[PDB]
Amino acid sequence: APQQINDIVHRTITPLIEQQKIPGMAVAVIYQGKPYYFTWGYADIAKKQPVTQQTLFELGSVSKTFTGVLGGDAIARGEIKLSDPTTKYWPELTAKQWNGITLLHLATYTAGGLPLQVPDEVKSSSDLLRFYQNWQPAWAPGTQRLYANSSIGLFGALAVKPSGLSFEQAMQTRVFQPLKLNHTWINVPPAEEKNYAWGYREGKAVHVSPGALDAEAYGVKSTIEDMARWVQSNLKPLDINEKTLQQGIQLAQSRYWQTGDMYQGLGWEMLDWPVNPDSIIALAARPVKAITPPTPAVRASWVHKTGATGGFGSYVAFIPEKELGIVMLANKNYPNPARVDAAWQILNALQ
Numbered sequence: 001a002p003q004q005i006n007d008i009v010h011r012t013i014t015p016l017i018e019q020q021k022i023p024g025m026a027v028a029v030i031y032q033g034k035p036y037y038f039t040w041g042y043a044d045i046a047k048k049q050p051v052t053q054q055t056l057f058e059l060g061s062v063s064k065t066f067t068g069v070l071g072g073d074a075i076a077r078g079e080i081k082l083s084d085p086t087t088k089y090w091p092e093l094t095a096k097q098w099n100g101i102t103l104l105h106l107a108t109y110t111a112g113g114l115p116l117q118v119p120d121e122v123k124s125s126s127d128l129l130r131f132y133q134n135w136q137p138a139w140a141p142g143t144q145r146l147y148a149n150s151s152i153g154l155f156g157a158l159a160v161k162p163s164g165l166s167f168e169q170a171m172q173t174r175v176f177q178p179l180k181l182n183h184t185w186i187n188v189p190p191a192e193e194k195n196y197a198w199g200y201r202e203g204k205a206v207h208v209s210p211g212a213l214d215a216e217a218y219g220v221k222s223t224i225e226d227m228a229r230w231v232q233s234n235l236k237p238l239d240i241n242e243k244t245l246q247q248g249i250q251l252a253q254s255r256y257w258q259t260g261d262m263y264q265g266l267g268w269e270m271l272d273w274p275v276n277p278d279s280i281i282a283l284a285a286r287p288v289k290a291i292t293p294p295t296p297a298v299r300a301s302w303v304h305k306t307g308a309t310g311g312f313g314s315y316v317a318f319i320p321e322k323e324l325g326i327v328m329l330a331n332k333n334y335p336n337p338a339r340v341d342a343a344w345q346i347l348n349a350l351q
C-alpha cells in the first residue's frame with residue numbers, strides 16, 4: 001500500500017480495535033479502482049484462526065444494499081415498477097390498509113410504520129401473510145420513515161416474484177455472479193465454513209439465527225475482497241457490462257426521500273459531499289419530504305450503509321466524485337458512530 005493509506009488506516013483502526021475490544025477486523029480502502037486490504041486479530045478466538053482477506057463476515061443490514069440493487073435490476077428488466085401497488089404482486093394482501101402502499105414505500109421504509117423486526121413466530125408464507133394483513137399503520141403512506149426489515153424485506157421478496165426465481169437464486173444469478181462476487185453468500189456452503197468468522201456478543205461466539213425475510217434484509221455474508229469489489233461496482237457503475245445491473249445500481253442511489261440532511265435510496269443512504277461528519281436509538285420515526293421526481297445518483301455524495309447482526313458490525317461508504325470507498329468488517333457489533341468516525345477520518349484524509 002502507498003504509505004499514506006497504510007498510515008491513515010493503521011492509525012485510525014488500531015485505536016478503534018483497542019477501544020471497542022474488537023476480536024477481528026478487515027478493512028478495504030478503494031482508491032481509483034485499486035483496493036488495499038488490512039486485517040487484524042481473530043475470525044475464531046477459540047481455534048486461533050486469524051482474520052484474512054478470505055474471512056467471511058455477516059454483513060447484517062449492509063445486505064439491504066444488495067436487495068436494493070437487485071430490486072433496481074428488476075425495475076430495469078421491466079419486471080416491476082416502484083410505482084406499482086404492493087397488491088399487484090401479492091393479491092392475497094386484501095386488508096384495506098394496503099391501498100396506496102407501493103413497492104417504493106416498502107423499499108424505502110415509508111409504508112406507514114411497518115415494524116423493525118418480523119416477529120420470530122412468523123415462519124411460513126401463511127404466517128407472513130397473516131402478519132402483514134394484521135399490521136395497522138400508524139401513518140399514511142409516504143409521510144414518515146421508520147427503518148424496518150419487515151419493509152425492505154417484503155420489497156425484496158416481491159421484487160423477485162416475476163422472475164420465477166428464489167430470492168437467493170435471483171441474487172446469485174443477477175448480482176453476485178456478474179460482479180464476480182464468488183465468496184458472497186446468503187447461505188454459507190459447508191465448503192466455505194473454514195472461512196466463516198464467529199461473531200462475538202458479550203464474549204460468546206454467535207452466528208445469525210434464521211428468520212423470515214432474513215435473506216432479503218440482513219442475511220448476506222461476504223469477504224473483504226468481495227465487499228471491496230461491491231463498493232467499486234457501486235462507485236463506478238458505468239464499468240458494468242450487464243445493462244440492467246448497471247441501471248439497477250444507478251436506481252439504488254437515486255434520492256427518493258429526504259429527512260434532515262439524509263436522502264433515502266434503495267438500501268443505500270446518501271448525503272451531499274462534503275458532509276459535516278456530525279451530520280452523518282431502537283426506533284426513530286422521521287417525517288420525510290418526497291423528492292418528486294427522485295434525483296438520479298449524485299456523484300458528490302457520501303453514500304453509505306451500516307449493518308449489524310448480534311455478533312457482527314459492518315460499514316461501507318464511498319464518494320463517487322473522489323473515486324474513494326471503504327469497507328469495515330468486524331466480528332463484534334460495536335457502536336455505529338465509531339464506525340462512521342473512523343471511516344470519515346480515513347476518507348477525508350485521502351480525499
Ligand SMILES: O[C@]1(c2ccccc2)CCN[C@H]2CCCC[C@@H]21
Pocket residue numbers: 030033034035225228229230232233239
Ligand atoms: O476495480 C476492480 C476492483 C477489484 C476488487 C476490489 C475493488 C476494485 C479492479 C479492476 N477491475 C474492476 C472490474 C470491475 C469491478 C471492480 C474492479
